[PDB]
Design a protein around this ligand. Structure first.
Ligand SMILES: [Zn+2]
Length: 73
């Protein structure tokens, strides 16, 4: 006897969402009194402390995963 089979898989078109290749303002700014550095991404900001002051960011919070932020108005 004899027989065959078919198979395939189309790729995925992964696009970007970033608004601008680079942001002018940065919400994250080193607290260290005397450090002119900042990183848009919270992550890229972590290493900065380990690359400059070879340390990790401070602690100003506790085991909490809530928002309860001041909604508009
Ligand atoms: Zn710093």
């Amino acid at each position: 006897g004899s027989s065959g089979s078919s198979g395939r898989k189309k790729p995925v078109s992964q696009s970007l969402e970033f608004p601008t290749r680079y942001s002018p303002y940065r919400p994250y700014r080193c607290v260290h009194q005397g450090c002119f550095a900042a990183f848009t991404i919270q992550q890229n900001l972590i290493l900065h402390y380990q690359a400059v002051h070879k340390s990790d960011l401070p602690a100003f919070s506790a085991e909490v995963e809530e928002e309860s932020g001041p909604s508009s108005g």
